[PDB]
Design a binder for this molecule. Sequence first.
Ligand SMILES: C[C@@H]1O[C@H](O)[C@@H](O)[C@H](O)[C@@H]1O
Ligand SMILES: C[C@@H]1O[C@H](O)[C@@H](O)[C@H](O)[C@@H]1O
Ligand SMILES: C[C@@H]1O[C@H](O)[C@@H](O)[C@H](O)[C@@H]1O
Ligand SMILES: C[C@@H]1O[C@H](O)[C@@H](O)[C@H](O)[C@@H]1O
Lengths: 311, 312
Amino acid sequence: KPFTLPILTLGELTNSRFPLPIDVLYTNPNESAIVQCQNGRCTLDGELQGTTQLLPTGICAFRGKVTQQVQDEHRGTHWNMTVTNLNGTPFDPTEDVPAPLGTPDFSGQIYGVISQRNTNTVGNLPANRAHEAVIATYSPKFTPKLGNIQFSTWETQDVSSGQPTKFTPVGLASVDANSHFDQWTLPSYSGALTLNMNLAPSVAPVFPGECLLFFRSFIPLKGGYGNPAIDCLMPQEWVQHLYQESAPSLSDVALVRYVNPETGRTLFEAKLHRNGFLTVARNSAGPVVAPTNGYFRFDSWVNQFYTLAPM
Amino acid sequence: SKPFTLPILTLGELTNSRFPLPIDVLYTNPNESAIVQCQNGRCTLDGELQGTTQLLPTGICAFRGKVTQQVQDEHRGTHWNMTVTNLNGTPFDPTEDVPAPLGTPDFSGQIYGVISQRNTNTEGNLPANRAHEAVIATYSPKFTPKLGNIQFSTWETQDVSSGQPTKFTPVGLASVDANSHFDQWTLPSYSGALTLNMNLAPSVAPVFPGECLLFFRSFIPLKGGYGNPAIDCLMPQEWVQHLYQESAPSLSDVALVRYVNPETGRTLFEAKLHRNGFLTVARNSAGPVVAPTNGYFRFDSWVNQFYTLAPM
Ligand SMILES: C[C@@H]1O[C@H](O)[C@@H](O)[C@H](O)[C@@H]1O
Ligand SMILES: C[C@@H]1O[C@H](O)[C@@H](O)[C@H](O)[C@@H]1O
Ligand SMILES: C[C@@H]1O[C@H](O)[C@@H](O)[C@H](O)[C@@H]1O
Ligand SMILES: C[C@@H]1O[C@H](O)[C@@H](O)[C@H](O)[C@@H]1O
């Protein structure tokens, strides 16, 4: 079965690490952190890895039940919630995944809305509530691999114990010094001092002059100063496509061309690696300034020795 | 002729095309009295997007624009006038042949979400940000997205900035009480109440007796009050994306599809997938379709409109 990519322009793609549209392509060659995100991880022959799942609505989402309000040193009112799989089935900690699929894969204060629809009814319809909430993924109480996490609210009382609870992610609460936003630092999925397991592997350029190419989205902020971004290796639609197709990878590296369909011209070429990430021959950091109607077209299978035309 | 195909996605791998929600169940309601003419999740089988349908899951019931004015409510809350652009940031051209900016909500109700802002201008050199819960009443006379402006209301009384880039992230509904006017099949008046909506995707209905529409149903969160509201779409967003990609020619007015259990390989039921992008089944009851979670629709063959479906 021939390998293919979807024909979706940048303006028709979404981020696989947060529910955002792709805003720009981006490079950062001098990045010192190990790039090992766990969402938006899929091999070219369609094997989902890390915490990656298929739903755009599942990325950085949680489902579960609030248990109780809990004490925390930090500002706000805090709540423990058990978490299930996104499909409602119990999360089995013995499954070979880092955490429930969809779990956030970076350190930070994730801002969103907690909503509840009660199990018990009264015209035999249940009571509901929703409030803004923050999940600090760096907190010692962030233990999704153990089946429970903690969130904080501004609301002090109107969160119900033992009721079905949904977290809808919206952005970040803050990127100030004490908010520990670092998109390449993984949460400790089982808690402080524990080793993460079953991780999707780190990615890096191997060839001289090459750097990773990211699909970048700017992420909203609840408050404060900043213009934070989330970089994914492949957009969610590519994850969905590769998973569907399951085309055998005929080498370790696919040559792809970024094409302008209006002119038919190649703007640049890139290596699409077997494990599901892109590299380009670029010697600068920052956005790739190109029209959003551009898209990657699969050209051919090459190998690690192939030399990319400089961007 | 390029062969017609559907994605192989189970219900648990599909999302709603009319609100950012996972698909929870398949659903029928044969005695529905309303005209079904939703505008999101509309796509012909040969890949033509219709109504206000666009491809991004993040675009469904989303808005982008700038706040222009603060207006206090008489009783409670603050209202904010917002000019809206296309979701890609370009100016919305009201003369374009669409009902409203793509992504605009396609139903009457109080849509609950978060308005966020990231300022354009900066002596620190990082822009200021804010976000607050917000409600958009799509039935309101001030909901005129085809004219390029809407209004949202907040509990927050002051901290929303004018002239700054503004994003609406939908989350659910504010209420489904009587005075919240939730009706998933009542279209907003995109240009205001005395004006006719234009460029609409056509209404959908079964043509043959004994058939009813089959919906992909999602339950939508509530900010408060009692209720278990649901949003039914004609096709999931992944189907829209797939059909748009493939643009396979339609070889008849109807694609026969089978809902299959891959574990047994057995067909659970069959359905007509109509040219205009919707499903009908031979079922004479309302409610969820009880079917295994591993199930998915498989394209069988092109048939004729006169094809008689096996009763469910
Ligand atoms: C619920 C809380 O209401 C307060 O007035 C706000 O200042 C906070 O941002 C938060 O939204
Ligand atoms: C930078 C400041 O952050 C705060 O949280 C906001 O409430 C202000 O409007 C401002 O944007
Ligand atoms: C921002 C407002 O804060 C209040 O305390 C809440 O009761 C309202 O639901 C709303 O969220
Ligand atoms: C029915 C009631 O609606 C209100 O909005 C909520 O604040 C309460 O918790 C309760 O669910």
